[PDB]
């Protein structure tokens, strides 16, 4: 709910990434700090998870 | 999250001084006399797992 982005600009910038721009491998996950890191879509840093562990 | 190698939980680390990696291995019978205190059931087969938990 307090997700400081608006949600349509972090789904475009995922969905994108998940295009060719790296699926012409088609086997290829998108995850982790290697290759789920879409790029910098700026956000402020906080002691907070946002979802909690057992929410995860 | 916590420190970032740990956060995507790719790896699921656990530190414990005492656990055992052995299988069960052979097993042995030991009888005899108990005392008045002893909270164990008269006459009746059970399991050991330290040497601390005689006497109760």
Redesign the interface.
């Given at each position: 709910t307090t997700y400081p982005v608006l949600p349509y600009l972090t789904n475009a910038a995922y969905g994108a990434l998940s295009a060719c721009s790296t699926c012409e491998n088609p086997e290829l996950n998108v995850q982790g700090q290697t290759y789920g890191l879409l790029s910098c879509i700026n956000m402020p840093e906080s002691c907070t998870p946002g979802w909690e562990f057992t929410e995860v | 999250?916590a420190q970032?190698a740990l956060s995507?939980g790719?790896v699921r680390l656990c530190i414990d001084p005492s656990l055992n990696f052995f299988g069960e291995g052979c097993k042995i019978l030991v009888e005899g006399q108990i005392t008045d205190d002893a909270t164990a059931a008269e006459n009746v087969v059970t399991c050991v797992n330290s040497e601390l938990d005689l006497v109760e």
């Amino acid at each position: 709910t307090t997700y400081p982005v608006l949600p349509y600009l972090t789904n475009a910038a995922y969905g994108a990434l998940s295009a060719c721009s790296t699926c012409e491998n088609p086997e290829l996950n998108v995850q982790g700090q290697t290759y789920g890191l879409l790029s910098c879509i700026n956000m402020p840093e906080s002691c907070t998870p946002g979802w909690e562990f057992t929410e995860v | 999250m916590a420190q970032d190698a740990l956060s995507d939980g790719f790896v699921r680390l656990c530190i414990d001084p005492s656990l055992n990696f052995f299988g069960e291995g052979c097993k042995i019978l030991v009888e005899g006399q108990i005392t008045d205190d002893a909270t164990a059931a008269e006459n009746v087969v059970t399991c050991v797992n330290s040497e601390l938990d005689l006497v109760e």
